Amino acid sequence: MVIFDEHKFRTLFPEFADPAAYPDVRLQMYFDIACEFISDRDSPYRILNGKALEACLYLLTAHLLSLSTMQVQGAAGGGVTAGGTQGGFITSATVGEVSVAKLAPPAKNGWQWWLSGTPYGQELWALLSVKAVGGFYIGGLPERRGFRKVGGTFW
């Protein structure tokens, strides 16, 4: 478990600087929820270590907070919408005589598609993609140490 710092979180994301609209209890609760999507245990032998793990946890917390605060007060009727607001990437938009079309991200399952909803989720996905290079070797024993090779060595 990693101790959540409200001051650092507010410094990193100035859009959450308002203490009245964003109480500390909500941030702590969302951090507690987010520590289940990603393990909060830290060891030096992991892939996401220390500050990287902290950054991922903070980004996930911000993503959850934004998605949650979307519903409560947006529809001009206090979220009177029957089914709430559905998230997701917006490929195209149009307002009067202004039109924008964007590039669809390469989502292939629920995790990435959900992460693509908000910029914090996109940044988290990018960081995970960078850190995901390579692979694991789990089972095996050093069998080659028993045979002499090249220059009379066993390494």
Binding site: G135, G139, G140
Partner: protein
């Protein structure tokens, strides 16, 4: 008895080489060498 874990976009491939033909080449060359020297191969190489 070990397992390697790779990404969905990653791939692995292997290649080999067949060495089941050098025998005839080597032995034919040695037979020709024995033929040049006017000596039976069973003495130069010690075996037919």
């Amino acid at each position: 008895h070990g397992v390697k874990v790779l990404g969905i976009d990653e791939g692995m491939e292997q290649f080999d080489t067949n060495l089941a033909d050098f025998d005839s080449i080597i032995m034919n060359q040695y037979q020709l060498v024995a033929a040049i020297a006017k000596t039976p191969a069973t003495k130069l190489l010690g075996t037919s």
